[PDB]
């Protein structure tokens, strides 16, 4: 950590009604900072990021989600401290995280948003960051997040005429149906799934 680093406190100085929860770790890069952002302010915060002076040169590197409902500390349970970020995973249905890179500040900024509503509603930002379109499409299809005000909600990387969210911990890697060829129908069909257990 022998570098010059400054917290991205501009967001919370401007959005004066929000509380700040920020982290930095040596597990990340020296210039990488994590923060907690509420969903109802996520869209406005991205609006501010996309056009603030020092945050103008910001690109949305990555976006995804975590099914925190089934998250459990498998080892060193007692070592957990109240300041750790893992404390926000427990009992929360979903956690959608975005990661941006800023060139002026040579920094990486990750924002975590907790989704507790059962339908997983959150405002999309693909209208602010263009590359977020396919990222949010993938996230919605794989985890079932209901993005709102999204440019294109059509599936991306999922099969035709199928509805599912495979990346949820409830889903099984083997799937629920297999595609074979039917001679009677003289074409590919899909039927129930029987697999091999090692």
Partner 1 sequence: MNHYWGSSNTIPASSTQNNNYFSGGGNNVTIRGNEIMERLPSQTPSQNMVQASMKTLRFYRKFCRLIPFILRIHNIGTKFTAQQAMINFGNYIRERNHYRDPGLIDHRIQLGYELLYEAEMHFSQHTILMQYLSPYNTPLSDRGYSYLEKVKYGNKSKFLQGFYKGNKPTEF
Partner 2 sequence: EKEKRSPSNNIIIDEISNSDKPITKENRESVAHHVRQQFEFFREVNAEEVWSVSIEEKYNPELYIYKTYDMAADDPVWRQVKLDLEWTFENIAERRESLGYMPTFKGDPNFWQ
Partner 3 sequence: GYIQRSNIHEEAPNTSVEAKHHNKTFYDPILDIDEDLKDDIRLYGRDKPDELDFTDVWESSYQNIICPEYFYHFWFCGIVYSFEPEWTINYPFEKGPLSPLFRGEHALRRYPTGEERCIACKLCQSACPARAITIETEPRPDGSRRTVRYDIDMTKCIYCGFCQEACPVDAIVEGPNYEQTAYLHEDLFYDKYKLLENGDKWEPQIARNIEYLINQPL
Euclidean distance between CA atoms 79 and 59, whole angstroms: 36
Shortest spacing between CB 2 and partner 3, in angstroms: 4
Shortest spacing between CB 197 and partner 3, in angstroms: 9
By the criterion CB under 8 A, which residues form the site for partner 2? 3-4, 6-7, 9-10, 13, 16, 22-24, 54, 83, 104-106
In order of 11, 111, 129, the CA distances from 46 in angstroms are: 10, 10, 9
Question: Are 101 and 115 spatial neighbours (Cβ–Cβ below 8 Å)?
Answer: no
For partner 1, the binding residue among 44, 121, 172, 193 (CB under 8 A) is 121
Which range of residues in 1-9, 78-86, 97-105, 139-147 is near partner 3 by CB under 8 A? 1-9
Nearer to partner 2, 90 or 103 (CB): 103
Residue from 189, 173, 170 nearest 181 by CA: 189
Contact track, partner 3, 26-65, x by CB under 8 A: x---x-----------------------------------
Q: Regarding beta strands 58-66 and 22-23, do their DSSP bridges make them parallel or antiparallel, or are they unpaired?
A: unpaired
Count CB-CB contacts under 10 A for residue 36.
17
Shortest spacing between CB 128 and partner 1, in angstroms: 15
């Amino acid at each position: 950590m022998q570098n010059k680093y400054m917290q991205p406190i501009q967001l919370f100085i401007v959005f004066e009604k929000l509380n700040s929860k920020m982290w930095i770790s040596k597990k990340l890069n020296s210039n990488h900072s994590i923060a907690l952002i509420p969903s109802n302010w996520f869209y406005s915060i991205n609006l501010f990021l996309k056009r603030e002076l020092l945050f103008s040169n910001i690109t949305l590197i990555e976006n995804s989600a975590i099914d925190t409902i089934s998250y459990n500390l498998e080892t060193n349970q007692n070592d957990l401290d109240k300041t750790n970020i893992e404390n926000y995973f427990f009992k929360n249905k979903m956690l959608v995280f975005y990661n941006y890179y800023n060139y002026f500040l040579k920094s990486k900024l990750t924002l975590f948003i907790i989704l507790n509503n059962l339908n997983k509603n959150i405002d999309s930002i693909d209208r602010i960051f263009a590359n977020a379109n396919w990222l949010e499409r993938e996230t919605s299809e794989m985890y079932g997040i209901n993005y709102k005000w999204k440019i294109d909600t059509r599936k991306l990387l999922l099969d035709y005429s199928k509805i599912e969210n495979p990346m949820l911990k409830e889903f099984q890697s083997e799937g629920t149906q297999d595609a074979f060829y039917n001679i009677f129908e003289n074409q590919v069909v899909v039927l129930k799934n029987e697999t091999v257990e090692l």
